Structures are given as C-alpha cells and as structure tokens.
Amino acid sequence: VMNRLILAMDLMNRDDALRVTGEVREYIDTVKIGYPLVLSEGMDIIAEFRKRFGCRIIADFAVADIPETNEKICRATFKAGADAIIVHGFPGADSVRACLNVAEEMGREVFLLTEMSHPGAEMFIQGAADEIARMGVDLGVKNYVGPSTRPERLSRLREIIGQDSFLISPGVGAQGGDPGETLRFADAIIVGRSIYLADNPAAAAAGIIESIKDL
Amino acid sequence: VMNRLILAMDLMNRDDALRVTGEVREYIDTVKIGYPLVLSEGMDIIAEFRKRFGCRIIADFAVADIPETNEKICRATFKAGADAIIVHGFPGADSVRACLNVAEEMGREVFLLTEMSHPGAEMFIQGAADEIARMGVDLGVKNYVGPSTRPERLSRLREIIGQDSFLISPGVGAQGGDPGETLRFADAIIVGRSIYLADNPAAAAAGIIESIKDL
Ligand SMILES: COC(=O)c1cc(=O)[nH]c(=O)n1[C@@H]1O[C@H](COP(=O)(O)O)[C@@H](O)[C@H]1O
Ligand SMILES: COC(=O)c1cc(=O)[nH]c(=O)n1[C@@H]1O[C@H](COP(=O)(O)O)[C@@H](O)[C@H]1O
C-alpha cells in the first residue's frame, strides 16, 4: 500500500470523513472503513470513497457470525464495492471458509484478524491466536491482521504465516504502538485517531511517513 | 417475549423482510435484525420495523472490536432505534464494558454472546465460553445468548448466569436445534430460516408456538 500506511476512517460524519480523507490522500492508497462510518452514513459511502479518492477500500467489519450469516455479510459488503473484508478467526474454520468462498466468487480478498490490539485481547484471544493463524494458513488465507501494541506477538504471527503473506497492523499511535517497530513485522500499519483527530491530519500523516521512510 | 419466540429477520430485501415480518407479527413481540438486512437496506430499517410492527428490535451486530470502536458501534445502533445489541464476549472485558457504558447512557440493553451455535464454535469459543459467561456475570450483564445446538452447553450457561438472567438461543430448526429442549434452559428461542424460508411463514411460526405451548 502506498507508504505502507492505511487510514482507519472512523469519523462518523460524512463531511468530516471526506475532508480528512481528501487531506491525506496524497500519502495513502488504502482506506479502512468500518461500522462507525457505515452505520452512520450508509453502505453507499464505500463506493463514494472509492470513486472520489480512487483508493482501495478495506471493509473492517470484524465479521464474527455463523457461516451462513457470514456469507450474507460478505456478499453485501462486496456488492457495495469493498476490495477486501476483515474477518475474525475466533469463530472457527467454517465461519472463515464461508467468507473465503464469497471472496473467491466475487474476485476479492479476506483479511483474517488473528490477535487484537486492546488490553482485553489478553483474556481469550491471545491464547488462541497462534492456532487461529495456523488455521488461516491451512485455509489458504494470505492476508492477516495482528497487533501493533504487541510486536513480540506480531513477530510470532509473521513466523506462522510466512514472509509471503500480507500482514497489516492496527494500534499505532493512540493505542501505544510505534510505526517503525510494527513495520519490522507488518507490511503496512493502520492509523486512525493519530491522523483523523489531529489538528492537521496531512501533517500527522506526513510525520508518520517520514519516520517510515527512515526504516 | 411474546410466545418466547424471536424472529431472526435475515432476508436481504426490504419488501420480502416486511412481508414475512408482517405475516408473523401476531406470533411474536421481538425481531432480531442483523447485518444481512442492515447492510442491504440501511440502518433506517430498524426504525421502520419498530414503527410498522410495534415490535422490540434486537440489533444482532455480534459486536467484536476494541473498546473505542465498540462504543461508536453501539452509539450508532441505539441512535437508529434498536432496543438492544448483541455483543461478543471473546474480545474481553473492556470491549464488553464499553458496550455496557453506552447502553447505560442511552437507556438500552446489551446481550452477551457466550458460545456460538455452529460447528466451528467448537474450535476456540467453546473452550472459553464458561469464562466468558462468568465475565458477563462479573460485569453485571443480565442478558445472554447461547446455543440451541448444544443444550448441555446451554444448561451449563444457565448454571453460570443464574435463573434471573435472560437467555435467548439461536440454532433452532435449520441448524438442528429443537424448540422444546432449548426452552428447558433459554427464556426465548431465536428462529430465522425455519420461518422466513417457509412456504407459509405464519404456519411455520404457529407450528413452533404450538409445540412451545405444550411445554
Ligand atoms: C476489527 O478491526 C480492526 O481492524 C482492529 C482490530 C484490532 O485488533 N485493533 C484495532 O484497532 N482495530 C481497528 O483499527 C482501528 C485502530 O484505529 P486507531 O489508530 O486506534 O484510532 C480502529 O478502526 C479499530 O477498530
Ligand atoms: C451473532 O449473532 C447471533 O445471534 C447468532 C449467534 C450464534 O451463535 N448463532 C446464530 O445462529 N446466530 C444468529 O441467529 C440467527 C439464526 O438463524 P437461523 O434460524 O439459523 O436461520 C442468524 O441471524 C444467526 O446469525
């Protein structure tokens, strides 16, 4: 992705979301749009972003249901123009395969969320995360998400998925993660608040990119 | 809930969703609306259903993100008029507390999803489910979701949450669960396809209710 930086656009107002995305577009080629924006402004926001900004869109819907429902969610998500969807691994292999099937049908991609970045992830997810990743490999998943806040866990993930798989990582900035350290293991970092709540989002993005180019 | 039966309205077309819900409204007082319908027709469908049918609405959004994102999701969901939201316990206590905080702010309810009903739940969720339920109790959660497909697990859940907590249960019909057995432990059953794919949804709902009244 351009500059190895993905914007997490979690503002919940279309006008503000368009403004910030437009201001930082020169520094990214990929925007992650989640439920905060979609449930506030509608699924049509995905196609609007893709057209206006010409950026790839990852639908961060943390998909976590039974297989039949996951199918429906993916179909709706790709019909709305998303390039990829983020799917939880914790519900198990059938739930993940359902998403992979729809992606194969519609020519898109699944990202498997393996271990989450917040403190509560330590309770249940972390203990399963290596296995979730190994399940991903066994299902042929090639794209993964793991936590900037725990680079030792992000290293272990990379170890499981191999060098060829694509790994993106949230928790940089607001949650405490560091861009450079995270990029030792991830291919790209996801950044939301450190950019979209900044007084000058373009300056914040540029500052991050400048510390990235130094790698 | 009326007749202890909650309709899972996972049709993805507003016209079909309105037709089936209207046909079965005499037999229910509560409709669960999930992402299949919302991502297809928009969040405004929640208020439309609540007004047209006068039914309570549970937003089944299987909320499974970090605390700050979960907050945003709940706020948007209640702003759209939902009476309650379904939240995953697997992301841990902070993610769940974030949802409880918004519910307390806005005068609504959280249902905690503890163990899922599909085969893949056996891989990771089942091994954590007792703890997830105990975490719920410790956070003051009063409403829970557990699996019709495993009544022995549904019994163990009930055992943890106590007699006073409210427990609803999907996986009845299509997934193999039985109404009467599930209602030995759950307060209400969730039913989707067995009703909404039936040639006569009113007849299917009535058939279920008739086997329920016999308890
Ligand atoms: C489930 O979706 C994610 O991509 C996600 C997983 C995770 O473990 N941590 C995490 O922060 N995210 C998302 O990534 C974004 C992080 O944004 P932030 O930089 O903290 O403001 C935000 O959209 C989160 O919901
Ligand atoms: C996460 O949301 C749920 O309520 C859910 C959890 C679960 O473990 N099993 C489960 O079936 N559900 C939902 O309940 C509905 C079941 O519908 P069905 O009767 O199988 O057609 C459908 O909306 C599922 O997504």
Swiss-Prot record, chains A, B:
<feature type="binding site">
    <location>
        <position position="193"/>
    </location>
    <ligand>
        <name>substrate</name>
    </ligand>
</feature>
<dbReference type="InterPro" id="IPR013785">
    <property type="entry name" value="Aldolase_TIM"/>
</dbReference>
<dbReference type="InterPro" id="IPR047595">
    <property type="entry name" value="OMPdecase_arc"/>
</dbReference>
<keyword id="KW-0210">Decarboxylase</keyword>
<feature type="binding site">
    <location>
        <position position="32"/>
    </location>
    <ligand>
        <name>substrate</name>
    </ligand>
</feature>
<dbReference type="InterPro" id="IPR001754">
    <property type="entry name" value="OMPdeCOase_dom"/>
</dbReference>
<dbReference type="GO" id="GO:0004590">
    <property type="term" value="F:orotidine-5'-phosphate decarboxylase activity"/>
</dbReference>
<protein>
    <recommendedName>
        <fullName>Orotidine 5'-phosphate decarboxylase</fullName>
        <ecNumber>4.1.1.23</ecNumber>
    </recommendedName>
</protein>
<dbReference type="GO" id="GO:0005829">
    <property type="term" value="C:cytosol"/>
</dbReference>
<comment type="similarity">
    <text>Belongs to the OMP decarboxylase family. Type 1 subfamily.</text>
</comment>
<dbReference type="InterPro" id="IPR018089">
    <property type="entry name" value="OMPdecase_AS"/>
</dbReference>
<feature type="binding site">
    <location>
        <begin position="170"/>
        <end position="180"/>
    </location>
    <ligand>
        <name>substrate</name>
    </ligand>
</feature>
<feature type="binding site">
    <location>
        <position position="10"/>
    </location>
    <ligand>
        <name>substrate</name>
    </ligand>
</feature>
<dbReference type="GO" id="GO:0044205">
    <property type="term" value="P:'de novo' UMP biosynthetic process"/>
</dbReference>
<dbReference type="InterPro" id="IPR014732">
    <property type="entry name" value="OMPdecase"/>
</dbReference>
<dbReference type="InterPro" id="IPR011060">
    <property type="entry name" value="RibuloseP-bd_barrel"/>
</dbReference>
<comment type="pathway">
    <text>Pyrimidine metabolism; UMP biosynthesis via de novo pathway; UMP from orotate: step 2/2.</text>
</comment>
<feature type="binding site">
    <location>
        <position position="117"/>
    </location>
    <ligand>
        <name>substrate</name>
    </ligand>
</feature>
<comment type="function">
    <text>Catalyzes the decarboxylation of orotidine 5'-monophosphate (OMP) to uridine 5'-monophosphate (UMP).</text>
</comment>
<feature type="binding site">
    <location>
        <position position="192"/>
    </location>
    <ligand>
        <name>substrate</name>
    </ligand>
</feature>
<keyword id="KW-0456">Lyase</keyword>
<dbReference type="Pfam" id="PF00215">
    <property type="entry name" value="OMPdecase"/>
</dbReference>
<comment type="subunit">
    <text>Homodimer.</text>
</comment>
<keyword id="KW-0665">Pyrimidine biosynthesis</keyword>
<feature type="binding site">
    <location>
        <begin position="60"/>
        <end position="69"/>
    </location>
    <ligand>
        <name>substrate</name>
    </ligand>
</feature>
<feature type="active site" description="Proton donor">
    <location>
        <position position="62"/>
    </location>
</feature>
<dbReference type="GO" id="GO:0006207">
    <property type="term" value="P:'de novo' pyrimidine nucleobase biosynthetic process"/>
</dbReference>
